[PDB]
Design a protein that fits this description.
heterodimer, A: alpha+beta, HIV Type 1 Reverse Transcriptase, Chain A, domain 1, Alpha-Beta Plaits, 4 domains, 5-stranded mixed beta sheet, 4-stranded antiparallel beta sheet, 10 helices, 16 strands, about 30% helix, about 20% strand, elongated, B: alpha+beta, 5 domains, binds the ligand Cc1cc2cc(C#N)ccc2c(C)c1Nc1ncnc(Nc2ccc(C#N)cc2)n1, binds magnesium ion, Reverse transcriptase/ribonuclease H (chain B), transferase, hydrolase/inhibitor, Polymerase
Chain lengths: ~400, ~550
């Protein structure tokens, strides 16, 4: 019934980000939603004295025919104060982790008055024939960094009985998402999840669930080919890949293998491996089987995620903080209605990687997408199904390290 | 007395840390003073302003201007300093509507709302910042001190507050009358509808009646503005629209400014006049920055100007948007990185047209440019019509599939069909994925001295073929490209090539068909003539035979 004082960072005014073009369907959906939200006192009309603005659009969650209002609070979140929980390292060690959407709960807590002006947003009209409908939030808005921090005190006391009753289940909270992990059987797991959402509904669309399996999350080691006959091209690619691996693993040697390439031979000509070469290759395998030396996580640094398009619906990715120091590596080959759409695939990939990163470290990585800025920015909203939005930059120069990760 | 609803005031504040304006009042002639006294007297009668005591420390300069040598003077309050200290507002005037997205109307009536402007009250706690002083005769008495009670003309927040208040007033009327459309511009309200003219007039009278609830009286006469309407450079007709007459001037000599004007008009006219080119005229303005500097027109630009004059020969109109019908956008290649497009619903009836020029870069191909054009048109369409149009592109399906399935980046184009209108976009070469059996293997390399700028470029093969060429005024990268060029020149229709240059490979893997660099262009021309080309990369200085750096170390 009482609000907590919220302010921005010293020397920073509220966000003034432009509203990007919305389609007809999304505009109708947003109008329909914001009408009812206005009726429920969640949002209110504002005048021209509010110059601030935050982009907004609409999506559809995993298998749902009901639109969801999503706000891009990325600029507000980096301008708002740092609201000052040690991340559950056991969350990535559980057998099954269900993601829940507890965003609606935030709408039960009033927002600080003197801060409301900063959550201003605009529903645009087609061709701007009519003035855009401007709103601001009266309660805790979904997607805002302050919402889970403020509601934390409430959420704790809300979940106390369930947590006391089940001391094995690991619960984590990130933005509008609640990650609930356990080692129970999938059926009993679903029963516990349903029990939890019924425990939340009784406490005052939380019916959807998003199940993950951190135990089945496979990692990518560096592998070298095993052939009976090596061509010049094969050996050249091998030496190249090993030379790249030398930046990660110190003891990598290619001298003896390079001795096979001496003399200008044809690329298709088969070269029989000498003993020194085979020994060198063996040692290299043994080195590549070991973990990377001096790899640690720094909570104060940024997570960086790189993605490579491998073709045939396959993508590879790496999450790190320092170059040649991968905290995570992975590979996807998903068929989610994107057989003939690269951008849809890449979007889903970004969402999956981000989800994994949230589970493991507790925050989202900065992406480096193999795509032109315009192309991505034109289409990524049409395939987005997450309540959060990570940061991203664009790489325009084809990385030579593509096939080496495949 | 009929009770009228009070107009809600907008809470206006100054920028944080700033105080109101304190500018001295300029000395005036006795004439101007008398005039201002009379004017401000009647304005005080109307309730626009009010006399204030000596307590108010703020002041804004006021001037008197003789209107075009007439018998009447006019008041001019210089609100610049106050505007510098006035907060920012939500300007809804940003991003004007485009005529191509409008819907045709049988009747469009205009109403004057200039008198409705002064019915908008200024925030009481802000009025003190709008204080101004009329100088007294011979400065022998304390000057007359006024402050505004309504929205001052010239003030920063006046248009935004006016538009917002007016919109808030019109909202229920527009809501309960969905058979009409209302748009506000300056001191004029525009109302359009497809209703029968009687029902329409009825609607207008109902609008006036509704405005009477806030005491807003609009002139009870036929407005002087009837279709067509001149608006933001457009001609708005009931069933069609166009751009205001584009007149290309006749000149024997052109300056920088003249060319800027020309390209301006051409760019503005390119939204309805199809085929308008501007590259040869815009490339003459490369690093000039001298409005009076006369630039000689190249023949390439003269021809372009001629073609533009041929296109702008006779007036061209565009139709309005019909939401019931499908939206189609067709694209054509003009060459030199130029692209043109038309957006229509029914054949030969364009809603609008447009163009796209390639971005600034070192290398590019037609496929990428086509993609970019598609993206631009898509975004523009979502802005204007709120949906994505169906595309007609000069590119084979097979070509596009081959492109996007092999391209290292992720690319996508919405629903589109192929239209056979040359020049068609094509892939000019395609590198192999595996080494070629039987084909000669060219180990290439290039290296240059950084100081003397002396270099060498060349190759060695498995058949024993060799070449080393001396080069002057060159770099390492140039030599590395030159080596590949030599390998392409002296090889058959099928050839393998081994290079250690990450740079060259970085260029060729981007798959350009055109470049700023002549060397790269020559390489491309060599690639097109080949049947099969495999390009392999190896680490340099790693004892890999064939990679004869020793023939370049000299
Ligand atoms: C966005 C807009 C700008 C205007 C600018 C002026 C001016 N000067 C006048 C009226 C204006 C109007 C009604 C507008 N609003 C609007 N909304 C939906 N359809 C249309 N169609 C339309 C069809 C013929 C005509 C004509 N002749 C005008 C608009 N217009
Ligand atoms: Mg070299």
């Amino acid at each position: 019934i009482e609000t907590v004082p919220v302010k921005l960072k010293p020397g920073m005014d509220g966000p003034k980000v432009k509203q990007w073009p919305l389609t007809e369907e999304k505009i109708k959906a947003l109008v329909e939603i914001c009408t009812e939200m206005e009726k429920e006192g969640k949002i209110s009309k504002i005048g021209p004295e509010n110059p601030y603005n935050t982009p907004v659009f609409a999506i559809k969650k995993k298998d749902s025919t009901k639109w969801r209002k999503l706000v891009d609070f990325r600029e507000l979140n980096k301008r708002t104060q740092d609201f000052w929980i040690p991340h559950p390292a056991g969350l990535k060690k559980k057998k099954s982790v269900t993601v829940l959407d507890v965003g609606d709960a935030y709408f039960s807590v009033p927002l600080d008055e003197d801060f409301r002006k900063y959550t201003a947003f605009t529903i645009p009209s087609i061709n701007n024939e009519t003035p855009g409908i401007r709103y601001q939030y009266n309660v805790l808005p979904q997607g805002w960094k302050g919402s889970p921090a403020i509601f934390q005190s409430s959420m704790t006391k809300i979940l106390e009985p369930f947590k006391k009753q089940n001391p094995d289940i690991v619960i984590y909270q990130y933005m509008d998402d609640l990650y609930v992990g356990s080692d129970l059987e999938i059926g009993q797991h679903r029963t516990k999840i349903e029990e939890l959402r019924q425990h939340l509904l009784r406490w005052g669309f939380l019916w959807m669930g998003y199940e993950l399996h951190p135990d089945k999350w496979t990692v990518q080691p560096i592998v070298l080919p095993e052939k009976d006959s090596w061509t010049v091209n094969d050996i050249q690619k091998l030496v190249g890949k090993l030379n790249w691996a030398s930046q990660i693993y110190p003891g990598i040697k290619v001298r003896q293998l390079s001795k096979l390439l001496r003399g200008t031979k044809a690329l298709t000509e088969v070269i029989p491996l000498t003993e020194e070469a085979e020994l060198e290759l063996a040692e290299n395998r043994e080195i590549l089987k070991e973990p990377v030396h001096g790899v640690y996580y720094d909570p104060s640094k940024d997570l960086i995620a790189e993605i490579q398009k491998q073709g045939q619906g396959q993508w590879t990715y790496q999450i790190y903080q320092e170059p040649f120091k991968n905290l995570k590596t992975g590979k996807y080959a998903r068929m989610r209605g994107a057989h003939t759409n690269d951008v849809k695939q890449l979007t889903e990939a970004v969402q999956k990687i981000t989800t994994e990163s949230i589970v493991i470290w507790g925050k989202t990585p900065k992406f480096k997408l193999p795509i032109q800025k315009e192309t991505w920015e034109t289409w990524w909203t049409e395939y987005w199904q997450a309540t959060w939005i990570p940061e991203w930059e664009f790489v325009n120069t084809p990385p030579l390290v593509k096939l080496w990760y495949q | 007395m009929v009770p009228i609803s009070p107009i809600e005031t907008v809470p206006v504040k100054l920028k944080p840390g700033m105080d109101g304006p304190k500018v001295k009042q300029w000395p005036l002639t006795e004439e101007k003073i008398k005039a201002l006294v009379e004017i401000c007297t009647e304005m005080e009668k109307e309730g626009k302003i009010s006399k204030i005591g000596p307590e108010n420390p703020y002041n804004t300069p006021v001037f008197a201007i003789k209107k075009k040598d007439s018998t009447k003077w006019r008041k001019l309050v210089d609100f610049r300093e106050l505007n510098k200290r006035t907060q920012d507002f939500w300007e809804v005037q940003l991003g004007i509507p485009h005529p191509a997205g409008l819907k045709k109307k049988k009747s469009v009536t205009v109403l004057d709302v200039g008198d409705a402007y002064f019915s908008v009250p200024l925030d009481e706690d802000f009025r003190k910042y709008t204080a101004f002083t009329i100088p007294s005769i011979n400065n022998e008495t304390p000057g007359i001190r006024y402050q505004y009670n309504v929205l001052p003309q010239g003030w920063k927040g006046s248009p935004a507050i006016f538009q917002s208040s007016m919109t808030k007033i019109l909202e229920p009327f527009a809501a309960q009358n969905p058979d009409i459309v209302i748009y506000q511009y300056m001191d004029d309200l525009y109302v359009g509808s497809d209703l029968e003219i009687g029902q329409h007039r009825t609607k207008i009278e109902e609008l006036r009646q509704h405005l009477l609830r806030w005491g807003l009286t609009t002139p009870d006469k036929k407005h002087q503005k009837e279709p067509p309407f001149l608006w933001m450079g457009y001609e708005l007709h009931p069933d069609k629209w166009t751009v205001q007459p584009i007149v290309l001037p006749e000149k024997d000599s052109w300056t920088v400014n003249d060319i800027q004007k020309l390209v301006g008009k051409l760019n503005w006219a390119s939204q309805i006049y199809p085929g308008i080119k501007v590259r040869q005229l815009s490339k003459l303005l490369r690093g000039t920055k001298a409005l009076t500097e006369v630039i000689p027109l190249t023949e390439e630009a003269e021809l372009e100007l001629a073609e533009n004059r041929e296109i702008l020969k006779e007036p061209v109109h565009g139709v309005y948007y019909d939401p019931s019908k499908d939206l189609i956008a067709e694209i054509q290649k003009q060459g030199q990185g130029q692209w043109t497009y038309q957006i229509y619903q029914e054949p030969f009836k364009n809603l609008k047209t447009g163009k796209y020029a390639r971005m600034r870069g070192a290398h590019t191909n037609d496929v990428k440019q086509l993609t970019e054009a598609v993206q631009k048109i898509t975004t523009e369409s979502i802005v204007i019509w709120g949906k994505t149009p169906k595309f007609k592109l000069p590119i084979q399906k097979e070509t596009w599939e081959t492109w996007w399935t092999e391209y290292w980046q992720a690319t996508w184009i919405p629903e589109w069909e192929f239209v056979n209108t040359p020049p068609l976009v094509k892939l000019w070469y395609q590198l192999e994925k595996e080494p070629i059996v039987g084909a000669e293997t060219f180990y290439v390399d290039g290296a240059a001295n950084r100081e003397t700028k002396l270099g060498k470029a060349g190759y060695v093969t498995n058949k024993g073929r060799q070449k080393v060429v001396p080069l002057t005024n060159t770099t390492n990268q140039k030599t590395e490209l030159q080596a590949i060029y030599l390998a392409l020149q002296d090889s058959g229709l099928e050839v393998n090539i081994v290079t250690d240059s990450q740079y060259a490979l970085g260029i060729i893997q981007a798959q350009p068909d055109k470049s700023e660099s002549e060397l790269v262009n020559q390489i491309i021309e060599q690639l097109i003539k080949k049947e099969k080309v495999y390009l392999a990369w190896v680490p340099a200085h790693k004892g890999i035979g064939g990679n004869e750096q020793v023939d370049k170390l000299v």
